[PDB]
Structure 1
Amino acid sequence: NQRIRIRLKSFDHRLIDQSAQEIVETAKRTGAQVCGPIPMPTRIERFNVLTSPHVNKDARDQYEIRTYKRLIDIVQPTDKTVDALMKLDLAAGVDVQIAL
């Protein structure tokens, strides 16, 4: 009863789905059943920044940043699956957490 949990975090959804698709494709090639990827709710943070150097309270820029999360489950893992997962490259801008 060994299950592998993969969590992906990023600031760029196109990157995060590219990485998730690559991981899923590799796992399917190795010969293990996978579940996902499952999109978790996105986090959004906003800021209001005054633009003028001295006094204009109504002159502000509104910025935002988003955090995207993906969840992937691997069930019935073959022996080659794990070593393939550490052989898999790490792309900048996407953070990966693996739990056994």
Structure 2
Amino acid sequence: EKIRIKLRAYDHRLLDQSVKQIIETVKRTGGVVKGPIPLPTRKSEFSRILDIIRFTPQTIEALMEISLPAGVDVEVKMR
């Protein structure tokens, strides 16, 4: 089972700092990551995509706990 996450923000440095934290949290809990892939800036909006290809129960817990800046909006899909 995998997870796909897309992050968006109107501040690109804040965005990439958010992606880094997620990656660290995921790896800290025994998870495995693919990406991230940066998408083209569109209408002043920066976005990134990240795949979680391996995860533990601890990984899900931590992702639920994490409080991202409100400016960073998250979209999560299991598959």
TM-score category (smaller protein): over 0.9
* Superposed displacement of residue 88, structure 1: 0.6
Structure-2-length-normalised TM-score: 0.93
Aligned residues with identical type, % of pairs = 51
Structure-1-length-normalised TM-score: 0.75
Aligned to 1:93, the other structure's residue is in SS state: coil
Counterpart Cα distance in 1 of 2:68 and 2:18: 9
Segments of 4+ in structure 1 off by > 3 A? none
* Alignment partner, residue 27 of structure 1: 26
What number of residue pairs does the alignment pair up?
A: 78
* Superposed displacement of residue 76, structure 1: 1.7
Higher alpha-carbon Rg: 1
Query: RMSD over aligned Cα, in angstroms?
Result: 0.8
Between Structure 1 and Structure 2, the one with more strand by share is: 1
The Cα offsets for residues 73-96 of structure 1, whole Å up to 9 and x where unpaired, read as: 001211111111010112121101
Q: Where does structure 2 lack aligned partners over 5 or more consecutive residues? A: none
